[PDB]
Design a protein around this ligand. Sequence first.
Ligand SMILES: O=C(Nn1c(=O)c(=O)[nH]c2cc(C(F)(F)F)c(-n3ccnc3)cc21)c1ccccc1
Ligand SMILES: O=C(Nn1c(=O)c(=O)[nH]c2cc(C(F)(F)F)c(-n3ccnc3)cc21)c1ccccc1
Ligand SMILES: [Cl-]
Ligand SMILES: [Cl-]
Ligand SMILES: [Cl-]
Ligand SMILES: [Cl-]
Lengths: 249, 249
Amino acid sequence: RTLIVTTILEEPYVMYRKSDKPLYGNDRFEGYCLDLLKELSNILGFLYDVKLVPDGKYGAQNDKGEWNGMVKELIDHRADLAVAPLTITYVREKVIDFSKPFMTLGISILYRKGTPIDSADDLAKQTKIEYGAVRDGSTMTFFKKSKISTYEKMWAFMSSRQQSALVKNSDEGIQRVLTTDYALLMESTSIEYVTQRNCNLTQIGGLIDSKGYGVGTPIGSPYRDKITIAILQLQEEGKLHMMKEKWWR
Amino acid sequence: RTLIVTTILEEPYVMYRKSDKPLYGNDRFEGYCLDLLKELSNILGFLYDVKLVPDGKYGAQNDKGEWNGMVKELIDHRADLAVAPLTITYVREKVIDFSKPFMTLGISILYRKGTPIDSADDLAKQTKIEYGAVRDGSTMTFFKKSKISTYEKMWAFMSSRQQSALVKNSDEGIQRVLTTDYALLMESTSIEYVTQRNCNLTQIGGLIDSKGYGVGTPIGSPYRDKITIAILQLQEEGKLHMMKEKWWR
Ligand SMILES: O=C(Nn1c(=O)c(=O)[nH]c2cc(C(F)(F)F)c(-n3ccnc3)cc21)c1ccccc1
Ligand SMILES: O=C(Nn1c(=O)c(=O)[nH]c2cc(C(F)(F)F)c(-n3ccnc3)cc21)c1ccccc1
Ligand SMILES: [Cl-]
Ligand SMILES: [Cl-]
Ligand SMILES: [Cl-]
Ligand SMILES: [Cl-]
């Protein structure tokens, strides 16, 4: 009766709820994805038990093609739904089902307000403002693997000089953006979380490498179609915009 | 054997191929969506016959809930696939199947280069630069129906003064952007088509009202899952970026 929902700690999607005493059950967690799960549970009518993915991974394959993370939990039917910022990808779609994306995003540019900079075309042709991405992240992985000429060029730059233009994590990247003449390339959702808290920062340009976060289910699940419908229903009603503004403002 | 593909004339997705003699068959058409259909046909292995939607409509319901356009062709099994910029929506998803989006887009701002303007927040609080959208378009329909406070405010403005801030079509809107102090709100894809041909113009800010174009199929079609996989395959390989750059540059 009670569906098992696998998820992953990820701000502001899933966070431990702050409390003065140890909490139990789903009340331990809060965030955008917990609110989304509550709406889904009230549209389709189901009880749910949230369980963090034991290895804290989204889901990738090792050298032998063995899966891990939330994808493996669905593949092995240890979870009925994955309600998380789980990216819809070619390799994953072949082993699990995805709903239509509840959130769409891409690579954009975090930078200061009031600067001539205005696009990815402009950053690629100057060498004064140091620009890069989080080392070993999805954004960096995109630029490194890209066959698109212009993105190969931006990768050559940010990976030059011992890769000094890169940063270890988003936080260190953020602090580098505020403290020095540095422009960060990362997810538009993450940037939007930054611009709301650092009013001296903005988003420059549009999106590269579009993608979406969807709810994952085991292949053959009856909930895939149901959840897709509910997500689009919520989107049409503006409720997803409400949820996002709540946890990002 | 030969699948029937319903589509719709829409630049640069589907266009009549220019010729000095009358053309026949699929060679009459060209564009992004024809190239996408050719890739799909070579990944999944099928023959196709392109047929323009007889009423030239994407697909909406009349007062009695009766469907038209490409959706009706799929509902009535007069077409096997709809390969077109067909928007994934709640009402449509209930009567047809959609693949994962082959292109994602939203509302953005077309405007001049080198201006203090930098976001939808900035346009909403000034009354000097006249800004609006194409009358009776999806962008206008979004602002008019929105319950989000800030978008209600921008709608009140652009629909004030006998709605003078609005334009009849995109072309007239474009020419208004080049000739006067005017900022246009419309689809990010359409704006991207503009910035490539009017180098004195740029895209301001991010996306509002995210959505995606998907391939439509009749409910219960075996091609939905196949096409989703193929689209993601093409996306991962960078080929969709190649196709878009071809027809937009
Ligand atoms: O784990 C990887 N990526 N990844 C997924 O695969 C996924 O499904 N959802 C993800 C959601 C988020 C976010 F938090 F933004 F919601 C972030 N992320 C974390 C910090 N900046 C962004 C990363 C995701 C990964 C790591 C290294 C190289 C390639 C991929
Ligand atoms: O027909 C309507 N919308 N609409 C769809 O419903 C659809 O599925 N695909 C669409 C694709 C395009 C584009 F060309 F951009 F690819 C455009 N469009 C045309 C000009 N500017 C944008 C409009 C689409 C419509 C008309 C009035 C009010 C509400 C909706
Ligand atoms: Cl295991
Ligand atoms: Cl990712
Ligand atoms: Cl009919
Ligand atoms: Cl639309």
